[PDB]
Design an enzyme around this catalytic site. Structure first.
Site, PDB file in Angstrom:
ATOM      1  N   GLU A 284      -2.567  -0.168  -4.498  1.00 52.87           N
ATOM      2  CA  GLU A 284      -2.669  -1.411  -3.743  1.00 52.87           C
ATOM      3  C   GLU A 284      -2.408  -2.586  -4.673  1.00 52.87           C
ATOM      4  O   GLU A 284      -2.938  -2.628  -5.788  1.00 52.87           O
ATOM      5  CB  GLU A 284      -4.046  -1.548  -3.088  1.00 52.87           C
TER       6      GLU A 284
ATOM      7  N   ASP B 235       0.855  -1.181   0.000  1.00 54.63           N
ATOM      8  CA  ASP B 235       0.000   0.000   0.000  1.00 54.63           C
ATOM      9  C   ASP B 235       0.892   1.232   0.000  1.00 54.63           C
ATOM     10  O   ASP B 235       1.704   1.411   0.914  1.00 54.63           O
ATOM     11  CB  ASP B 235      -0.934   0.005   1.216  1.00 54.63           C
TER      12      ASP B 235
HETATM   13  N1  LIG Z   1     -11.662   9.237  -0.767  1.00 56.21           N
HETATM   14  C1  LIG Z   1     -10.511   9.054  -1.454  1.00 56.21           C
HETATM   15  C2  LIG Z   1      -9.478   8.288  -0.913  1.00 56.21           C
HETATM   16  C3  LIG Z   1      -8.296   8.107  -1.634  1.00 56.21           C
HETATM   17  N2  LIG Z   1      -8.172   8.678  -2.840  1.00 56.21           N
HETATM   18  C4  LIG Z   1      -6.940   8.494  -3.600  1.00 56.21           C
HETATM   19  C5  LIG Z   1      -5.830   9.342  -2.992  1.00 56.21           C
HETATM   20  C6  LIG Z   1      -4.834   8.357  -2.405  1.00 56.21           C
HETATM   21  O1  LIG Z   1      -3.488   8.737  -2.711  1.00 56.21           O
HETATM   22  C7  LIG Z   1      -5.188   7.017  -3.030  1.00 56.21           C
HETATM   23  C8  LIG Z   1      -5.139   5.905  -1.998  1.00 56.21           C
HETATM   24  O2  LIG Z   1      -5.753   6.389  -0.810  1.00 56.21           O
HETATM   25  P1  LIG Z   1      -5.522   5.631   0.588  1.00 56.21           P
HETATM   26  O3  LIG Z   1      -6.874   5.325   1.187  1.00 56.21           O
HETATM   27  O4  LIG Z   1      -4.509   4.526   0.406  1.00 56.21           O
HETATM   28  O5  LIG Z   1      -4.877   6.814   1.465  1.00 56.21           O
HETATM   29  P2  LIG Z   1      -3.440   7.437   1.089  1.00 56.21           P
HETATM   30  O6  LIG Z   1      -2.671   6.483   0.204  1.00 56.21           O
HETATM   31  O7  LIG Z   1      -3.677   8.856   0.636  1.00 56.21           O
HETATM   32  O8  LIG Z   1      -2.709   7.530   2.519  1.00 56.21           O
HETATM   33  P3  LIG Z   1      -2.750   6.283   3.535  1.00 56.21           P
HETATM   34  O9  LIG Z   1      -2.473   5.083   2.662  1.00 56.21           O
HETATM   35  O10 LIG Z   1      -1.663   6.600   4.536  1.00 56.21           O
HETATM   36  O11 LIG Z   1      -4.151   6.350   4.100  1.00 56.21           O
HETATM   37  O12 LIG Z   1      -6.532   7.128  -3.507  1.00 56.21           O
HETATM   38  C9  LIG Z   1      -9.226   9.450  -3.378  1.00 56.21           C
HETATM   39  O13 LIG Z   1      -9.114   9.983  -4.507  1.00 56.21           O
HETATM   40  N3  LIG Z   1     -10.367   9.618  -2.672  1.00 56.21           N
HETATM   41 CA   LIG Z   2      -2.163   4.162   0.511  1.00 59.69          CA
HETATM   42 CA   LIG Z   3      -4.908   1.870  -0.060  1.00 61.70          CA
END
Ligand SMILES: Nc1ccn([C@H]2C[C@H](O)[C@@H](COP(=O)(O)OP(=O)(O)OP(=O)(O)O)O2)c(=O)n1
Ligand SMILES: [Ca+2]
Ligand SMILES: [Ca+2]
Ligand SMILES: [Ca+2]
Length: 341
Positions: free
Chosen positions: A106, A7
Site C-alpha cells: 500500500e 494497493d
Molecule cells: N491477515 C493477513 C492479511 C494480509 N497479509 C499479507 C498478504 C497480502 O499479500 C498482503 C496484503 O494483504 P491485503 O489485505 O491487501 O490482501 P491481498 O493483497 O492478499 O488481496 P486483496 O488486496 O485483493 O485483498 O499482506 C498477511 O500476511 N496476513
Molecule cells: Ca492488496
Molecule cells: Ca492492502
DNA sequence: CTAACGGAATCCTTCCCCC
DNA sequence: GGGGGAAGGATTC
C-alpha cells in the site's frame, strides 16, 4: 487534496505467479507454517481462484486443505515479496515527491501538484497501472479521492484490478449511506460498540453528543470519525519511518522452563539483529504469547545503544520478569527492538 | 515429532511518576 | 491539570 492510493492485488500470491507462470489460473495459497505439527499455521493470502471458495487470510492451513485439497500450498517467502515491493515503490516515486508507504503493498501518493481535476488524476492512475504492469507485470488497484481515507475506500470497492474515483459529491452520500464497519480503522471490537450506540453510518456520529461517543471508543477514535462525518478530514501524506523491528517464533511445545525457552529466545535475537542492518536501538522488548494466544511484554530502555551481547543478557532478565508475573505457559517467544538513533 | 490456529508492524488507552 | 514513559489492546496487512 487529491490522494492517489495504490494497493497490490493479492500481492504474495501474485508474486509467486510471476516467478512461476504455470501457476496462473490455478488456486494458489501462500501459507505460514509454524513448525509444531505438519500443516500447522495460517493462510497469509490466496489468489482469487482460491478465495472464491472462502480460502482467504487468517484461516488455518488444515481448514483450507479441506476446502481445496488440490490447491497449490506454497510457503511464504516474505523477502522475495519485499524485493518486488521495493522495486514497485520506486516506480511510484516518479509521480509524486510526497509519497506515504503504508504497508508492503500500500502506498499513498499526494498528486495535488501534478493534476488539475479528478479526470486527470484518473488518467494518471491508468498510467501508473500500465507502468507497473509493464516493468514488473503486477496488476494493482488505484483509489483516488480528496483524502487518504476515501482513497483507500475507493480502492476497496473496485478491488480486483481496477480504478475508482470518489468525487466530492459521492463522498457526501457515503457519509450518510456507507456502512461504518467498512471504514478504515474500524474493526469488530469498535464496530460492535458503535451499533450499541445506534451508529451504523458516518452521519450518525454528528447527532450523538461527544462524551457519549468518547467514553466508548476513546477520544482519538471519536474525533477521527467526527472529522470524516463533517467532511473535514485532511491528514497530509507523510513519509513513514520504521519504528520497530521484531522476530517471534513458535516453540515446539508449551513450556515454562527457562533453559528450554532460551534457544528460541536467542534465535529471535539473532534474526532480529540481522533484520536491524545498522540502526542501533535503545530499547529491547521480550514478547511472549501465552497458552491462549494472549500477549505479554516486558521492556527495558537504555540511555545508549544495545549490543548483541547486551540484548542476550538483558532478554533473560526480561524473560524472567514475565515468568514471575504470569502463570500461563508460553506458546511463542520473541524480541522487538525500538527507539532507534 | 507431528497436537484446533502465523508473523509483524502501527497508534491509542490506561496507569502512574512527576513538574 | 498536564507531560511523558511502560504495558495492554485494537487495527490492519
Ligand atoms: N491477515 C493477513 C492479511 C494480509 N497479509 C499479507 C498478504 C497480502 O499479500 C498482503 C496484503 O494483504 P491485503 O489485505 O491487501 O490482501 P491481498 O493483497 O492478499 O488481496 P486483496 O488486496 O485483493 O485483498 O499482506 C498477511 O500476511 N496476513
Ligand atoms: Ca492488496
Ligand atoms: Ca492492502
Ligand atoms: Ca472492516
Amino acid at each position: 487534496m487529491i490522494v492517489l492510493f495504490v494497493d497490490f492485488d493479492y500481492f504474495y500470491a501474485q508474486v509467486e505467479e510471476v516467478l512461476n507462470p504455470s501457476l496462473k489460473g490455478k488456486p494458489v495459497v501462500v501459507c505460514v507454517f509454524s513448525g509444531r505439527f505438519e500443516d500447522s499455521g495460517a493462510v497469509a493470502t490466496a489468489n482469487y481462484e482460491a478465495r472464491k471458495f472462502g480460502v482467504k487470510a487468517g484461516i488455518p492451513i488444515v481448514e483450507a486443505k479441506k476446502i481445496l485439497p488440490n490447491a497449490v500450498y506454497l510457503p511464504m517467502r516474505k523477502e522475495v515479496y519485499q524485493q518486488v515491493s521495493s522495486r514497485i515503490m520506486n516506480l511510484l516515486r516518479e509521480y509524486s515527491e510526497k509519497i506515504e508507504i503504508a504497508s508492503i503493498d500500500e502506498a499513498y501518493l499526494d498528486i495535488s501538484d501534478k493534476v488539475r481535476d479528478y479526470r486527470e488524476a484518473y488518467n494518471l492512475g491508468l498510467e501508473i497501472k500500465n507502468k507497473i504492469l509493464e516493468k514488473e507485470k503486477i496488476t494493482v488497484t488505484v483509489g483516488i479521492s480528496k483524502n487518504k481515507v476515501f482513497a483507500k475506500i475507493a480502492a476497496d470497492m473496485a478491488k480486483p484490478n481496477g480504478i475508482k474515483v470518489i468525487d466530492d459529491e459521492e463522498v457526501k452520500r457515503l457519509i450518510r449511506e456507507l456502512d461504518i464497519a467498512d471504514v478504515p480503522g474500524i474493526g469488530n471490537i469498535t464496530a460492535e460498540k458503535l451499533k450499541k450506540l445506534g451508529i451504523n453510518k458516518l452521519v450518525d456520529t454528528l447527532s450523538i453528543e461527544f462524551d457519549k461517543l468518547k467514553g466508548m471508543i476513546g477520544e482519538a477514535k471519536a474525533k477521527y470519525l467526527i472529522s470524516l462525518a463533517r467532511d473535514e478530514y485532511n491528514e497530509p501524506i507523510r513519509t513513514r519511518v520504521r519504528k520497530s523491528i521484531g522476530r517471534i517464533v513458535t516453540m515446539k511445545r508449551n513450556s515454562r522452563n527457562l533453559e528450554e525457552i532460551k534457544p528460541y529466545l536467542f534465535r529471535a535475537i539473532e534474526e532480529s539483529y540481522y533484520k536491524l542492518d545498522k540502526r542501533i536501538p535503545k530499547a529491547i522488548h521480550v514478547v511472549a504469547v501465552t497458552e491462549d494466544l494472549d500477549i505479554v511484554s516486558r521492556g527495558r530502555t537504555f540511555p545508549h545503544g544495545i549490543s548483541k551481547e547486551t540484548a542476550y543478557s538483558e532478554s533473560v532478565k526480561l524473560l524472567q520478569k514475565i515468568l514471575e508475573e504470569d502463570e500461563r505457559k508460553i506458546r511463542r517467544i520473541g524480541v522487538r527492538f525500538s527507539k532507534f538513533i
